[PDB]
Design a protein around this ligand. Structure first.
Ligand SMILES: C=C(C)[C@H]1CN[C@H](C(=O)O)[C@H]1CC(=O)O
Ligand SMILES: C=C(C)[C@H]1CN[C@H](C(=O)O)[C@H]1CC(=O)O
Lengths: 259, 259
């Protein structure tokens, strides 16, 4: 049957095309993950339908109810067959779903407004004049909440106690906060998003310092799914063919607006 | 029972300790992969024995006999339970063994003697005054042999036809050739090895340009092994704890000899 793909709108991975109202089906969407879903399906020989996760989440388990939300939840509970999105490969997700080998590398990174006198996480951690935070859901927040590393633990303590709230709900909100805060907000976000934004007008942000960790995004399937093996081999094939690098250049750099 | 680990001597992943003749068992060895094997075993709760692959290979299948050699072969044929080494995650290996999520990122990279007027693969590809090659076995050679990308295809054609042979048998041989060829040899090798060497005396090499691809090393087990799941979760746990970054710094940078 048609494979149900769950994904989520996030630039430049999945976006509704400007003229989407005139299109149908999968053709309504564009972006890195859209292109990737099409290549994976072509290599594994299946038809598929892109659907957008209802709750707008990636995947976390409620501590009380023990229910998985997000795209991971759609897989775990049988609502979707595959998740193709900037879904960070984490231990807690790997315990309940199957992940491909990573299709893209990333790490938590610092986005500043140009001119901000910050060069590293340790720099942020030692001060408060420049506020800093993360998405209020997702693997970045969890990284900090869970870290036993001294600098990241101090940052997490800072972020929980800082007022007003340093958390944002969306990547767009975080970028807007950076751009509007006159150098007094720094956003901690995945390096991929950071790099994407740095290439976009008004060219007033930049990624600074090293990344805080290293990890990858993977394609996820329900545990035991017969699709898993084929999609993993497809990811490795596409990587080896240079197609993943091509897609990254297409969506991040090829039409870069900032020099 | 005790888990049989197959690995291979390659610096700084696995090395015999200077006083190994006075030690026994796993304690004879040191390096990044030695440390990693110990952490994985501790997290998965097994005892293990480090053994060194007999044929000194990583893993490739003979086109005629269809027999797998190297550490991959030891797994496929039941001689070892787990392979812990700088074993590049490739499609052809993933078809016959199980790989963890990557424990370390890398890409094919160019090593030059300092002062060599080369900044990229495309630079090498356009000339012949500076000879360039790879290991005569391994994933780097296969990358070139198999590439359909124009620049890498031209490089492969160059390497097959260049005289004398541009291939080397070991990383040490490649480094020595770079250091001894007065800027007239460049070595194509994994970025991890390149970065390691760049930090060692006599500080006369360096990694130049971007990497030519992106990939990872993974821990490998025989297909269907019950160890697979646990070792994969261990790798993700160790990554998330910052232990993999710590090990890389330990073996590459902490005692760097070159500034
Ligand atoms: C943009 C969203 C909320 C995602 C994408 N990857 C991370 C994930 O899979 O949880 C989340 C980002 C983050 O936590 O900075
Ligand atoms: C050093 C050896 C021959 C290894 C390590 N990784 C690659 C592999 O797993 O094949 C080989 C290196 C290379 O091909 O440049």
């Amino acid at each position: 049957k048609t494979v149900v793909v769950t994904t989520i709108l996030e630039s430049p991975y999945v976006m509704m095309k400007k003229n989407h109202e005139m299109l149908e089906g999968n053709e309504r969407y564009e972006g890195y993950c859209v292109d990737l879903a099409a290549e994976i399906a072509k290599h594994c020989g299946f038809k598929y339908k892109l659907t957008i996760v209802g709750d707008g989440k990636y995947g976390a388990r409620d501590a009380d109810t023990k229910i998985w939300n997000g795209m991971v939840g759609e897989l775990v509970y049988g609502k979707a067959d595959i998740a193709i999105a900037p879904l960070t490969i984490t231990l807690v997700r790997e315990e309940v779903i199957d992940f491909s080998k990573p299709f893209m590398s990333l790490g938590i990174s610092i986005m500043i407004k140009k001119g901000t006198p910050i060069e590293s996480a340790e720099d942020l951690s030692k001060q408060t004049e420049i506020a800093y935070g993360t998405l209020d859901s997702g693997s970045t927040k969890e990284f900090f909440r869970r870290s036993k590393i001294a600098v990241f633990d101090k940052m997490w303590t800072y972020m929980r106690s800082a007022e007003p709230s340093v958390f944002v709900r969306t990547t767009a909100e975080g970028v807007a906060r950076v751009r509007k805060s006159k150098g007094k907000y720094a956003f901690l976000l995945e390096s991929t998003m950071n790099e994407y934004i740095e290439q976009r007008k008004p060219c007033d942000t930049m990624k600074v310092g090293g990344n805080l960790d290293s990890k990858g995004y993977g394609i996820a399937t329900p545990k035991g799914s017969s699709l898993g093996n084929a999609v993993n081999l497809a990811v490795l094939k596409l990587n080896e063919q240079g197609l993943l690098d091509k897609l990254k250049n297409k969506w991040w750099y090829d039409k870069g607006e900032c020099g």
